[PDB]
UniProtKB/Swiss-Prot annotation, chain A:
Atypical E3 ubiquitin ligase that can catalyze ubiquitination of both proteins and lipids, and which is involved in various processes, such as lipid metabolism, angiogenesis and cell-autonomous immunity. Acts as a key immune sensor by catalyzing ubiquitination of the lipid A moiety of bacterial lipopolysaccharide (LPS) via its RZ-type zinc-finger: restricts the proliferation of cytosolic bacteria, such as Salmonella, by generating the bacterial ubiquitin coat through the ubiquitination of LPS. It is linked to Moyamoya disease 2: A progressive cerebral angiopathy characterized by bilateral intracranial carotid artery stenosis and telangiectatic vessels in the region of the basal ganglia. The abnormal vessels resemble a 'puff of smoke' (moyamoya) on cerebral angiogram. Affected individuals can develop transient ischemic attacks and/or cerebral infarction, and rupture of the collateral vessels can cause intracranial hemorrhage. Hemiplegia of sudden onset and epileptic seizures constitute the prevailing presentation in childhood, while subarachnoid bleeding occurs more frequently in adults. It comes from Homo sapiens (Human). The chain holds residues 4234 to 4308 of 5207 of the full protein. Autoubiquitinated. Belongs to the AAA ATPase family. Monomer. Interacts with UBE2L3/UBCH7; UBE2L3/UBCH7 is the most efficient ubiquitin-conjugating enzyme E2 for the ubiquitin ligase activity. Interacts with UBE2N/UBC13; promoting 'Lys-63'-linked ubiquitination of target proteins. Induction: Down-regulated by let-7c miRNA, which binds to the 3'-UTR transcript of RNF213. Induced by pro-inflammatory cytokines. (Microbial infection) Up-regulated in macrophages infected by M.tuberculosis. It is found in: Cytoplasm, Cytosol; Lipid droplet. Widely expressed (at protein level). Composed of an N-terminal stalk, a dynein-like core comprised of two catalytically active and four inactive ATPase domains, and a C-terminal E3 module. The ATPase regions do not generate movement but rather act like an intricate molecular 'switch'. The RING-type zinc finger domain is required for the ubiquitin-protein ligase activity. This is E3 ubiquitin-protein ligase RNF213. It comes from the Eukaryota.
UniProtKB/Swiss-Prot annotation, chain D:
It is found in: Cytoplasm, Cytosol; Lipid droplet. It is linked to Moyamoya disease 2: A progressive cerebral angiopathy characterized by bilateral intracranial carotid artery stenosis and telangiectatic vessels in the region of the basal ganglia. The abnormal vessels resemble a 'puff of smoke' (moyamoya) on cerebral angiogram. Affected individuals can develop transient ischemic attacks and/or cerebral infarction, and rupture of the collateral vessels can cause intracranial hemorrhage. Hemiplegia of sudden onset and epileptic seizures constitute the prevailing presentation in childhood, while subarachnoid bleeding occurs more frequently in adults. Widely expressed (at protein level). Belongs to the AAA ATPase family. It comes from the Eukaryota. Atypical E3 ubiquitin ligase that can catalyze ubiquitination of both proteins and lipids, and which is involved in various processes, such as lipid metabolism, angiogenesis and cell-autonomous immunity. Acts as a key immune sensor by catalyzing ubiquitination of the lipid A moiety of bacterial lipopolysaccharide (LPS) via its RZ-type zinc-finger: restricts the proliferation of cytosolic bacteria, such as Salmonella, by generating the bacterial ubiquitin coat through the ubiquitination of LPS. Zn(2+) 3 binds at C39, H43, C47, C50. This is E3 ubiquitin-protein ligase RNF213. Composed of an N-terminal stalk, a dynein-like core comprised of two catalytically active and four inactive ATPase domains, and a C-terminal E3 module. The ATPase regions do not generate movement but rather act like an intricate molecular 'switch'. The RING-type zinc finger domain is required for the ubiquitin-protein ligase activity. Autoubiquitinated. The lineage of its organism: Eukaryota, Metazoa, Chordata, Craniata, Vertebrata. Changing V70M: Rare variant detected in a sporadic case of Moyamoya disease. Monomer. Interacts with UBE2L3/UBCH7; UBE2L3/UBCH7 is the most efficient ubiquitin-conjugating enzyme E2 for the ubiquitin ligase activity. Interacts with UBE2N/UBC13; promoting 'Lys-63'-linked ubiquitination of target proteins. The gene is RNF213.
Amino acid sequence: LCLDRAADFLSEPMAKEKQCYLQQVKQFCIRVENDWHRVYLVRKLSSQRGMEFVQGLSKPGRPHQWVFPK
Amino acid sequence: KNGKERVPILWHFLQKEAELRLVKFLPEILALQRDLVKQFQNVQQVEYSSIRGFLSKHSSDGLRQLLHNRITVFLSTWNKLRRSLETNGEINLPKDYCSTDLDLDTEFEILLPRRRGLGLCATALVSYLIRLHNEIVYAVEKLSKENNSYSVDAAEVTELHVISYEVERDLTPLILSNCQYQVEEGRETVQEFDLEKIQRQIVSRFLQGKPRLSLKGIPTLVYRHDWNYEHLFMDIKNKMAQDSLPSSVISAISGQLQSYSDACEVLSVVEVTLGFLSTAGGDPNMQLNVYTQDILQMGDQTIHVLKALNRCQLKHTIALWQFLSAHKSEQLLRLHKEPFGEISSRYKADLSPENAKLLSTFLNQTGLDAFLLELHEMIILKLKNPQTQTEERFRPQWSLRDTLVSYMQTKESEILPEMASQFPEEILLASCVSVWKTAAVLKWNREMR
Amino acid sequence: SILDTTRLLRSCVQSAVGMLRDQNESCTRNMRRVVLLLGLLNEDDACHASFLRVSKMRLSVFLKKQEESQFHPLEWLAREACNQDALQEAGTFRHTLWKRVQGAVTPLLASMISFIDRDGNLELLTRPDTPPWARDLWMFIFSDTMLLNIPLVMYIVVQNHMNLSENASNNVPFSWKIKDYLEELWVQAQYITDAEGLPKKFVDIFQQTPLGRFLAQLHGEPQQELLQCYLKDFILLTMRVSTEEE
Amino acid sequence: NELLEPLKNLAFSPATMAHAFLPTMPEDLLAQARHWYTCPNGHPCSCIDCHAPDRTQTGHVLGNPQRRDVVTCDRGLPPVVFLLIRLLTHLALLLGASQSSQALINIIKPPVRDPKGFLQQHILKDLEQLAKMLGHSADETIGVVHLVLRRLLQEQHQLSSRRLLNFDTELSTKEMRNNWEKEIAA
Ligand SMILES: [Zn+2]
């Protein structure tokens, strides 16, 4: 549900609380190393925005590269 | 899942949910409109700039902010519904009104739900709740198996009656709690929504009540200049019986009232009596002087009135008004004074030679007394008021015969053979004052002879 | 004095009441209004004298407000002398002027009657069982021009708020205006003051008002009875009740 | 196929569909209902307050898509099916706007400066609502759209005969449009 909330916040086409929550999720993902958590997130993002949105986030010059596994 | 049969309440609720959520607001909108009525009721002119101006006028900070809140609720609800109201609502609405969203700069009239102009929008929105709530209540009633669900009117409306639900707070937890899952060895989990239980819970929570209606009316008063006596006459006739003046009584009053002043005095007493009877009523056989003196206590100002009205009864009142008015004007005509200053000159057109001969022939072979009285009543009621100008179904170019027949019909009055047959269609509504003048001149000549 | 304004009012009572229409369709109202106003428009008792005086004062207020919109309001006699229609309707000049004043006063008197006698008010002045405090409050409110604000008007509808039965009246004079007043004071105090401290601020603001000081004059059982009556009218104004037990 | 001809006209020959009734339409239920009565002068009445005892529009009448949180169709059809009809219609309209914009400006009410983008936004909102209704991914939803278009292409000469469906290729009236809708839905 936390990853779902982050996926929604990212799906939006700009708030301190959302950004702080996203940073906490980033740190949690980096710390715990269970990359399955990011798989779900990518999956949810694809469901909401589409695969091309995730592809666009993967490309260099992107701020959300942490969404993806290693 | 065959829901319209299996779950009709849930089906209709889900269809209308988008709009039904807005049903919770309308108690507040009703309170707003009630206070707006209270403030502006019995007022006729509205010089307010707009809602922003109106708020600035009632800038008492507490009251300003409460009004602002309510107005914002109204504007939000209207903005959402307006595009549905343009197609649904049972109340027609010019496309311009529903076209664009409203803001504080919008005209203030939009908030007063008058039965005309921009106030129809305030009426429509209030009506469109009433349909939605009622319709889903009907849906529940058809499945309650009962026929006594207590109704309520738009005055007693409170949040307890309206269908108040919040999607996230109330509904979503309901669905999620009903949403169940199934699994079998080697098979995926699959949902199975307990649709019956969703319906039963929604019914148990939200669905009860019924509203009716409430609001003002624009014609607040049509006083002296535009006074619509026709409405008073019809109200009285509905309330009690009415009768024409016997020719004996007519001649008696004519002999007594040999002066315009006395006529006016009697007529003022008749007008007071008309107002009272229209509201209250009374025994049609009661003598009018006894009524004015005993009940209305109209003493200290009744000298010759009591002698003229000694024979007249309440049922004669309308006919007596008509006689007096025509006699009043007739007196003026006898003295060559203009009695129809309140009438538009356009309605005072001449009569051409051909139409003059035709009218003279009709009048020679006509019921001159009834004709004069009816034409006078028609002129005075219809053709007199600027108010009757803004309703121009009495255009000078309309024929006089059909106009007068229409009028007589609206009061369910008896039709004289001469009206359809002998009355010339060649005479329009513009010569009506020339027609009355010619008829009165012929009457006066017959009386002098 | 110059004019018998008492007589002019009494002459205009019927014409004014004839302007009044009720929402609840209480046919038996206008007649009783006429009886009541002709009884009250006297100098027999001090209550009648005060009612008549306040009627005259408020009429003066309305007429002055109208006069502030007209040119040379001293020339009214002259204007009547220029209305051949009114002259010939009246016959004598003196009656012309009398009718002029009656026409000016009748609308305003009808308006004032609509405000004062909204639900069943006037029964309270005349009914002998009406306690003294009730008549005193009636006249206090009627005398006040900023509490009982009556706007001008240029079919008058008497906005009956209760569904009361006829032969019955509001147990407290102008219960509706008092309710509106206390609600305005509640709003003002609420937005000025926190949810805690609002009760005390609302009570204080009220006590500082004319009506608060008036009711502060009332001590003991009269005030208790007033409160009971106001509760009853408050309920009737808030919730529609089809029975008396409820 | 005959069923496609209205949409084919919209896309390739929009000028003809100027006065056409499109599925992009809500209708006056009053015209179907033939409560609040009305006086002869026009002011409503539930004699009271008066002293005296078709709103169906053509063209594309939907305004800013931002308001479209939920879909409702008066003709009792499944909201999903009406949504798909609306989507196909908007695609045809987008094609027509590409062919000639002014025609769509005539067909779209209130007017607009950028018809194609407007229709794009409506289509995207349609996709959003489809995702909400069916519960599938955005791409799966677009796949449902492609599935439906495929069905129409396969049901093109499979519609050879058994074809008595009362509708005109120009959607001249309200019943022609309703009939086209119901056939499409079937
Ligand atoms: Zn109407």
